[PDB]
């Protein structure tokens, strides 16, 4: 219920907690993937806009590590678009939430950012609440009847729903399971390029909170102000991997197909390329602190330059974790039954 | 809702009661089963002169009979990591709850602490409440806009949820059935070494008093 | 809500109602079936009478 008439004063912001979407998701792909989001754009100033609403443009950004997935409040920026900064949670209000464009991820020719994916999600809404303040556009009078007494002035219809997810069960987990890909869905049938792969996961089933109670002064009678209450949050991860080497004879039909596709998986191969010889290679010092006037700067030329270096990821080394004998691992035995060997 | 504002005071506790995480599970292996649990650590060297927030570590241990399972507040100590013992019910406020390390028992070479294991678990929240103490961490200011007068005081954000297991049925029964050895996970195929075995189980549907 | 202090009395009984568990089962036998029920039994003879 919501009775009449209107109460309000200057500002009436309150304290609430809430919770969010239940999900499980994953992606495999050698090329790095993108991810779209919404944001304000440049509008025409040649119109006499009686409305004052700014436009909204989709920005097909490239997903970094530790940036934010969508939660269900618009896939928009929240720094430049929530001027109040006190309506959307603090964790996301100075960030931007994202979603994947699976169909534009389906519209890549080769299919190197997608090798496989899944997603498992459930949600229903518990509560319902609304906003205040000067609402943008008013109501047209000719779709209702008016009144007075308590029914004098109109009330703001600036509502919003509240997500509540679902139950968090283990009976439909997707982790801890082998997935032997029989056939990849696109043209790239699971082959990595440039000796790399980028994988991700977002899960809410493992998202508990780690608080911390620290009494600063011992006493046998209780005071609230003995306690500098802290909070942490922990997460534990691992991966397994089984590969297969493959032989590529560099024929003319292939070498025109691939250099045109990507010259960068030829530059590590340097077949018929004049710069990777060069001359005398890099000549290092031993480290001297004050003298040897050069410094640790990047004005020396980079042996590897890419805008992916401008983004920050979780760098995971596997140049040393290789093994030919596989039965000593709990998936190698799971493979020989799978391969029938 | 929260009608403003939070009030000062040093003593505001009360009795409440709530259920826990439900499960059914077991494990078998001819070595006793292990388990991690989180605790404190050594602080540091005193190079940092910033603040006081305590260290931490998980602790890998073979669990024995009687020890407590974690129910959602992390597998951790309630005496050392907490300090009021009033966030936690009395039976578990003086405990060091663990979670089993099937992971390192999977990366165990032979698999002698594991022959077979089961698990079935589900959960969802009941309500949302908040702690009552000095929040040791402050919140940055430009992330939001502060209010004034009655809304001049910034209330704390030390929220905490409270659990609920789902409905259970007799179709969700794990026990009282045969689970045949035909293929074990590791190198020890059912072989009890030392003519001994280490069996465990945790049930919640027969947990009334 | 169970907030402090008490508002007790020398009498505190009330009219309430509750619902139960959903039973559907089969049982057959040409021999009579038993049940179990906890009976108030005795300990040994002298337990020092600390708590009854």
């Amino acid at each position, epitope marked *: 219920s919501n009775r*009449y008439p209107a109460q*309000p004063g200057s500002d*009436n912001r309150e304290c609430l907690s809430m919770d969010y979407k239940q999900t499980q998701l994953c992606l495999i792909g050698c090329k790095p993937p993108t991810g779209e989001h919404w944001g304000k754009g440049v509008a025409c100033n040649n119109n006499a806009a009686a409305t004052d609403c700014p436009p909204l443009e989709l920005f097909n950004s490239i997903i970094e590590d530790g940036d934010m997935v969508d939660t269900g409040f618009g896939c928009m920026d929240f720094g430049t678009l929530q001027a109040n900064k006190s309506d959307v949670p603090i964790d996301i209000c100075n960030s931007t939430c994202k979603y994947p464009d699976y169909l534009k991820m389906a519209s890549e020719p080769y299919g190197d950012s997608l090798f496989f994916f899944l997603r498992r999600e459930q949600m229903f809404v518990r509560h319902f609440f609304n906003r205040a303040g000067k609402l943008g556009e008013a109501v047209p009078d000719d779709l209702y009847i008016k009144g007075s007494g308590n029914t004098a002035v109109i009330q703001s219809s600036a509502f919003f729903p509240t997500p509540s997810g679902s139950i968090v069960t283990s009976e439909s987990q997707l982790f801890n399971k082998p997935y032997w890909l029989q056939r990849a869905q696109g043209h790239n049938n699971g082959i990595c390029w440039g000796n790399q792969l980028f994988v991700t996961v977002v899960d809410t089933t493992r998202s508990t909170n780690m608080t911390l109670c620290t009494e600063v002064t011992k006493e046998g009678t209780y005071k609230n102000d003995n306690f500098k209450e802290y909070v942490r949050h922990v997460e534990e991860y691992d991966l397994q991997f089984v590969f297969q080497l493959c032989k590529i004879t560099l024929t003319a039909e292939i070498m025109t197909y691939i250099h045109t596709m990507d010259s960068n998986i030829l530059e590590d191969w340097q077949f018929g390329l004049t710069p990777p010889p060069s001359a005398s290679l890099q000549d290092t010092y031993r480290f001297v602190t004050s003298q040897a006037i050069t410094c640790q700067k990047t004005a020396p030329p980079k042996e590897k330059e890419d805008p992916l270096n401008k983004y920050t990821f979780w760098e995971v080394n596997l140049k040393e974790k290789f093994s030919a004998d596989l039965d000593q691992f709990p998936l190698g035995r799971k493979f020989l039954l799978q391969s029938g060997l | *809702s929260n*009608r403003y504002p939070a*009030q000062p005071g040093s003593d505001n506790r009360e009795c409440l009661s709530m259920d826990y995480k439900q499960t059914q599970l077991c494990l078998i292996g001819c070595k006793p089963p292990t388990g991690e649990h989180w605790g404190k650590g050594v602080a540091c060297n005193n190079n940092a002169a910033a603040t006081d927030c305590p260290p931490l570590e998980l602790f890998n241990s073979i669990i024995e009979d009687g020890d407590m399972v974690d129910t959602g507040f992390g597998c951790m100590d309630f005496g050392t990591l907490q300090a009021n013992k009033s966030d936690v019910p009395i039976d578990i406020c003086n405990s060091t709850c663990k979670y089993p390390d099937y992971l390192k028992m999977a990366s165990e070479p032979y698999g002698d602490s594991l022959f077979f294991f089961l698990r079935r678990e589900q959960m969802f929240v009941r309500h949302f409440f908040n702690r009552a103490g000095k929040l040791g961490e402050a919140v940055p200011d430009d992330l939001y806009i502060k209010g004034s007068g*009655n809304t001049a005081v910034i209330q704390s954000s030390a929220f905490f949820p409270t659990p609920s297991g789902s409905i259970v049925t007799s179709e969700s029964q794990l026990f009282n059935k045969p689970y045949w050895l035909q293929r074990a996970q590791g190198h020890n195929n059912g072989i009890c070494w030392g003519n001994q075995l280490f069996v465990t189980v945790v049930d919640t549907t027969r947990s009334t008093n | 809500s169970n907030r402090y202090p008490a508002q007790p009395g020398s009498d505190n009984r009330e009219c309430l109602s509750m619902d139960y568990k959903q039973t559907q089962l089969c049982l057959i036998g040409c021999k009579p079936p038993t049940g179990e029920h906890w009976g108030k039994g005795v300990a040994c003879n002298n337990n020092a009478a600390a708590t009854d």
Partner: antibody
Amino acid sequence: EVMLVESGGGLVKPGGSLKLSCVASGFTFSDYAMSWGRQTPEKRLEWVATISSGGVSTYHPDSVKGRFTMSRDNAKNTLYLQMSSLRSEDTAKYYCARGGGRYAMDYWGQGTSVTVSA
Amino acid sequence: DVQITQSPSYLAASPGETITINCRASKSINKYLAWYQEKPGTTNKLLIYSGSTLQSGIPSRFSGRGSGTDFTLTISSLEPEDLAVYYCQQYNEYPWTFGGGTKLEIKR
């Protein structure tokens, strides 16, 4: 029918305690704020205690700090005031209040004389 | 504390005319101000909260205004249930102090 019926105010030893109870007849007690305020003679109406719609926000003035503790019951529709170690200044006529608004009061009962004397 | 006082403390009036009441402030306790009345045996009534904004069931003959430290409230077209004592009360900060009180009397 919205009516806040006062109960529990009268004579009490100096340095003693007493239990007040402001039973409401009918509404939903969890929706609206509730409060305590007294009237002392030759002085203003003295706000003793306030509480919010559910019970989150309770406050007392400088006169009764540390000595007075406010409570409420939402099911028996009753607002409370547990005070300790009363003095002769607490002799007055006391109202309990219903808050129907932005901490604004639209009700009190007929009240009872809460007099700390001999 | 906030020490607000209510003046003039007494009103003798005949109805239909226009009657003014005031309350001045010690601090800048800007426009958060309600107004009450005490009839014995019945309940207190909130006429206007926040100085200018109206409660359920409250009619339009009341009028109150002011900001900063100055306030003005004015009433015409009276009705015979009005004879009571009226208060102003700050709630901009705790403790919630009151005005001195104004009793309205009818002239005969």
